[model samples]
Target: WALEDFEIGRPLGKGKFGNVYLAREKQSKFILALKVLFKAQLEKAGVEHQLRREVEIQSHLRHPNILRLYGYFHDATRVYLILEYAPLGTVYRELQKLSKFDEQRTATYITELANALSYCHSKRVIHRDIKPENLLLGSAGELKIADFGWSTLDYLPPEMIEGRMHDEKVDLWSLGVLCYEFLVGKPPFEANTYQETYKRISRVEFTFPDFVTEGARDLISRLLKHNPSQRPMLREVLEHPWITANSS
Candidate 1:
């Protein structure tokens, strides 16, 4: 689609490279979020290759719980991605407002998210980042993975804390952290100091609060285990007693 085909509306949000705006196709009046990224900035940051990988990976992924990348267009100075608009905002903001999500809501969200991640893993695409901020909420309160900027892993994993090579199990480890945050209102190994946090994460040392149920604790333990090989697959996660028992 041409730039003229879209009628850009208000600003949705801003990121390090550019801003996303509310946009709609003039003909269909179908609403979408336009992610406008500056070409010069992307090239200057030496992330042009990274951007290409992200687009390549996201465009091919088709899942209800994964954000849809309709397509992209580029002008002289900018690259624009047509994306589904999540008007209800992000799960991170919602979690902040509620402190923590109840077991039911958290269970439902994880069920959908696990299905999406499972699909990605089956396709050999591992999402290295699976944090609360990357979770966008749909109008019907559905959870979707919104960002894959870190899908290729430009940073450290607690295992190596550096240039460690990881596999799909990294996503499983993150799912554990995400699950903990959903119940405890914070990451499992959160600390005031980065060193302390890294230390905790590397050691896989965390204590659940008394409010966390036995089932939840058990599942979290299974996921957060130091040996990535020991972490349960998404299939096991869905069939786990905690997910099945709490879910309708």
Candidate 2:
């Protein structure tokens, strides 16, 4: 549908090149997030190709845990992405307020993400980015992975930092970081400085708080292995004892 088919509302969020707005389709009356990007800004930033790839990849993905890119339209000056509206906002915000998530919630979210990621991998799509800021909560309080744009330093895996050939396993590492952040309120490899963080990642150096369960610690340890080949596959992650024990 064209931009005119929807009635735009308040701003949902702002990005490097554009802003997302709350909108509703006039015909179906379906609520959505309209991501508006300025063509001039994208060209100036020289990331037009990245935007195109993001649209191509995200628009084709279909999973309950992934944010839906319904469709898009462009005019002379701007491009718009119609997306699923995650009413509860970002997981980062919730985590900030609560400090951390309980085992049940963390396990549930990890299970959902693993399932979605398995589906994406089946379609030959790799979600190179997986972090708290890239995840949102839908109306039913379900986790919806958002922002296909990319990653934060805290979630960087060893292979990526080492500039080695990488694949879907990178996501597995980030998922481990996400799990740590969800449970402990910060990334496992996070340090005061970027260099230190990178060093820690390279060394696979991190320890769980005493409060973290043995099952969860085991899962994180397995996923955060410095060797990509050592990391658990998505199916294995889904079947991990921690996930099966705590998730519904």
Candidate 3:
């Protein structure tokens, strides 16, 4: 009903559920960005359950590349998903701000993210939603992921992983897409609309340009397979030819 009161000079971005506001304590002046979600906004999205589960998954997950969920607040009409404010902002914006990542920066970012994915898989968590928008970087060169609304079960079973239910491997699928996007300079699946995009995802019909790095192509090829079971486990992926210490 009422927005939380705070000191002046905070900026708020328009979030689908509610506006995301940047605020700071008057005393310490430490800044915090708050994602405010109205209950009605959630109902409109028809994803309150997924949102709550994302909070749970993010709260339990801790890796250098995975953003930390500080806390949450939910009342009758609103919910506030408190998240770590990655000062560098989302990878999508970063990519657009510049043109594309040079090979070293791209490789470095992806390598760190893959390691984080490995740790998540070891803990049995799968980040279902992996995209440029979800990847965030900090001033010191840390890349953390946000938007857990679509993460899998991290690591459980066929029952847990059953047909889009949720599982750690799902993160691998997303990793492939994200990596491909980074290398290709845009989403590999460039459909005319949302339905077409989802269809391409469902069909697993995408490719990298010929100029994509050999290592990148190899990694994306392995990650973007149609069958989830065929995808490499996070551990093995870190050992992959493209990412291995000896890889060129």
Candidate 4:
């Protein structure tokens, strides 16, 4: 579609690359999100193929928690990606409005998130970012992975991709971090700047004060392994004693 396909007054989301506007067919009233990105911005980053792949495969990734990226178009000056719009806003805001998760609710969200993540892995999509900020709420408070600008289909190590391709294990790393972020209501390693944050993340520095459940504590410890290869796969994760026993 084109710019003419949209109407005004609907604000969806704002990201570093672009802004998402909620719109509909002027007459049909069908829903759509128009993500507008400046061509020069993407051109400067030299990320055209990354952008193309994100839009292409992301459109085909049909899962309940993964948002739908319908398609995208480019004119001479800018890029536009048609996407799904979640009305319930971000999970971050939701968390702020409500108290932290109780054991049962936390377990439920974690289980659902794992199932969704496993599905994404099966599709070869790695969500590099998996924080509360990237999760958007849908019908009945179901969670969906909202951002894909950082996601990729393959995981090549740093030495292999000339520093561009990160390993698939990175996703699991993020998942581990996300588990800490959600399970604890904060990051395992808290720092201000990006560099320091990476340092802390690399350090895997955090502690639970024993009030947290034994199952959760065990899972977090497993996920926060310094060696990515040591981290459990999502398939194996569900079978873990911490998960399977408590999920019962």
Candidate 5:
């Protein structure tokens, strides 16, 4: 489809390359998030190939917790991605509002995420990025994984930071970090400097606050193993006692 096929509305959010806008398809009246990225900026950042991979991967995935990438089109100056609009917005925004998620909510979210990741892994798709900002809330307030760009620094595993060859287990590490962030207000290894954070990550050094429960701690510990092979598979994560106990 073309840009003219949809009537653009308000701005939904901003990104490094450009901004996403609320849009509606005139013919079907289906609402969507129109992600508009400037070609010049993408070229300048040298991430055109990254964008291509993101589109290819996201468009093919069809899980309940994965956001839909309907299609895309481009003009001389910009590329427009037709995306599913999550009305409730990013989990990052909600997490900011309530310092952190309660055990039940966090558990439910994690369960959903684990199921989604299991599906992706089955299809040979590793969602290298799994931060709160990349998680959007669907109409029913369920979490949907958005943005297939790449990995984020705070969520990177030791293997990734060490520049070693890695596999889908990288996503398990990210899920551990995300689980911690969901329970606590911030990332487990977040330090004053990136260097210090990397040091902590490499050593797998982190402590849970008094409020975090034993079951939750166990789950996070299993996922955050320094050795990728040691990390629990997504299916195992879903079946964890903490998840089964707290998640509805």
Candidate 6:
């Protein structure tokens, strides 16, 4: 259906150049989120390619843990993306309300994310950002990777900080950061200054606090290695004992 075919409700969320609204398909009464992007801003920012890549990557991906992009339609000045309506809202916002997650919650989320990342790798798409802000919860309280705008990244990776090449393992590093945040209420490499943060990220340096579990810390250690090659692939991550214990 066209943009006019959907009745827009409250704003679901917002991104760089647009806002996503809670919308309903008029014909089928199907509830979905419509991301409306301003065309003028996209052109000014020269990010049409990024939007194109996002559409290319997300439209082809079909998995329960990944958000669905139904389709897109554009008008004279705006672009609309039909997306899956994740009822429980963003995990980042949820995390903000609750400082940190318990071990079980963190583990279960990590397990689901591993599956999602594995599927993305199989499809040759690397989600460069895997922070909680990009995650959303389903009605059943399941986790879904809801945003892939980082696809084009404009594309940066930890290895890129070292003037090195990166692959799917970039996602693994972000997963490690996400996992750490889930446990500690913040990213492992977060610093007061952006330069310091990047330095810490490039060096892959962080000490797990006493509150973190050994298994969780071990997986984070394996995933956060400065060398992308040293980071275990998502398959191995799924098989990690912490994931198995929580997921099963």
Winning model by lDDT = 5
Q: In model 3, which runs have C-alpha deviations exceeding 4 angstroms?
A: 1-5, 8-14, 44-46, 74-76, 150-166, 193-199, 245-248
Q: For candidate 2, write residues 1-248 as lDDT tens digits.
A: 78889999989776777889999999989888998899998888888888787788875777888888878899989999888899999998999999999999999899889988899889987887788877899999999987665224778788888899998998999899999999999888878898998899899889989999999999999999988999999989988888989854
Q: Can you write out model 5's per-residue Cα lDDT over 166-245, one digit (the tens) per residue?
A: 99999999888999999998999988888899899999899999999999999999999998898898878988899999
RMSD, every candidate, angstroms: 2.4, 1.8, 4.8, 4.0, 1.5, 2.4
Model 4 poorest ten-residue lDDT run: 152-161
The models' CA-based lDDT, in order, is 0.83, 0.87, 0.68, 0.69, 0.89, 0.82
**TM-score attained by model 3:** 0.80
Worst 10-residue stretch by lDDT in candidate 2?
147-156
lDDT of 4 by residue, 90-142 (tens): 87786676635566666666677788888877888776667777788777777
Candidate 6, 15-86: lDDT as tens digits: 688888999999999899998899888888888988998888875779999998989999888989899999
**TM-score: which candidate is best?**
5
Model 3: per-residue lDDT, tens digit, 77-183? 77876666778777878889876776667767777888887777677665656777667787787788777663312122223333555456667777776776676
Clashing pairs in 3: 65-144, 124-154, 124-155, 125-154, 126-154, 128-151, 153-167
Give per-model TM-scores: 0.92, 0.93, 0.80, 0.84, 0.94, 0.92
Question: What's the residue-level lDDT of 106 in candidate 6?
Answer: 89
lDDT for model 3 comes to 0.68
TM-score, candidate 5, is 0.94
The local distance difference test score of model 5 is: 0.89
The sequence of per-residue lDDT tens digits that candidate 1 reaches over residues 1-248 is: 77899999989775878788999999999999998999988877888887788789876788888888888999999999898999898788999999998888888888898999999989878786887777898888999897676231212346656447677887887888788889989877877787787777777678989999999998889988777788899999999999999876
> Candidate 6, which segments miss by more than 4 Å at Cα?
150-157
- In model 1, what lDDT does residue 246 have? 84
